[model samples]
Target: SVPEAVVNWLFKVIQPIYNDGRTTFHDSLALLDNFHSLRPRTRVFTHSDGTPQLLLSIYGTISTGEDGSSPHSIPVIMWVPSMYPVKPPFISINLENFDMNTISSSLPIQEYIDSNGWIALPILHAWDPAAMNLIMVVQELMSLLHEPPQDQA
Candidate 1:
């Protein structure tokens, strides 16, 4: 119920406000502040140019179980805005397995990550330190539930 309303209101009300803006981290924070139902967890990733890009981890609700297993765990979207066309931004899911050792240690984790559970979609722009405003565009894209075709990058 809450998620549905949140999703509906967000698509209708929020997108217009965020679609245009100057590049800055504050704009992203302000966007998240308006959505009370969905939660945002932010992270910073380095671009190929070695500059840092702030990533927003938007999470959906988690359902069921004691160990925290659920019919659905929060669906996560890693929003990376590409500032440089050559060095594309990517959406990496399962932040938990980011550790190199963990990925190497588990076969299932590796296979699952390689397949459905995780993805890294390119952000088709050149690197720009001041382009966080566009980061919201990436999130909006993820919310659409379709990853862009490789050339779309």
Candidate 2:
């Protein structure tokens, strides 16, 4: 759940910032250009009331081992925000059988990604499959604009 103060802040500050950045930019660039070198990054935030917002996390998919068990493959996903009026930019990750570099041949979405200088990162995350939510991802990604890798910062 969103806290009222946080909600107020989002509406007052974050929302406008997100809106302006999304509109002014022509594309979404990868926060991390190289997937292989990229590490899991997230913010562990606590609201005034102490409700925790783990922010979105990046994790590798775990493989189950043994008898009838097998390691689970990470699910592929594209997290995009509605801030784009025509074609919302996206960050795609963990393609099941898809290669990020070769995505242009598979879908027109690649064109949009390319225009934005975005990077498609593939990873096996340990996140719960059933809990993957699109809206949440969008908000999380938006927050990233204000948070960059230490070196970039």
Candidate 3:
């Protein structure tokens, strides 16, 4: 079977370097198949001070429940790294969708967001390649958003 241009281009240059990395690429797309609200695409994620890191991204609304139809949902963006499945990916949350702000909004700061607006999770702090997958992490993120924190910020 033939694959998408973007999927093949991924390994041609810099994205997936290992067989496991390729496996995660499919896992990432599967996430979209599992959720209708989210859209799959590409974007650059800046990791260091100035270097722009290109990554595969998935964006849209995330729900509290397994299904996208969950009553409580929030907008979110997840970035996939070339080292993904081997390393943790990046996730950014959108508060404007909630009609909220950090300074005045009652929601204040998200417990998940620790530095600036970056997300904080135990999974990243203590990573396990086999145990942690992008799909699982997204579900974990959704749970935190509707449930509710200050990140010692």
Cα lDDT listed for each candidate: 0.39, 0.34, 0.64
Rank order by TM-score, top first? Answer: 3, 1, 2
Which residue segments of model 2 deviate by more than 4 Å? 18-85, 92-133, 136-153
Error of 3 at 80 (Å): 0.9
Please give the lDDT score at residue 33 for candidate 1: 59
User: Clash number for every model?
Assistant: 8, 8, 1
TM-score, per-candidate, Cα-based: 0.31, 0.23, 0.69
Candidate 2 on 47-142: residue-level lDDT in tens? 459976433233332211112443223223343233433323235444444445422342333433343334332211323324433333334433
User: Which segments of candidate 3 are over 4 A away from where they belong?
Assistant: 1-20, 65-71, 101-109, 146-153
List candidate 1 stretches off by more than 4 Å: 1-19, 22-37, 60-70, 80-90, 95-153
Top lDDT model = 3
In terms of lDDT, the poorest run of 10 residues in model 3 is 100-109
Please write out the lDDT profile of model 1 over residues 1-153, one tens digit for every residue: 234554444444333333332322344444455443345554575656898855444543322111323122223454434332223334435464343442223222232244544443333333444453434444443343332345755
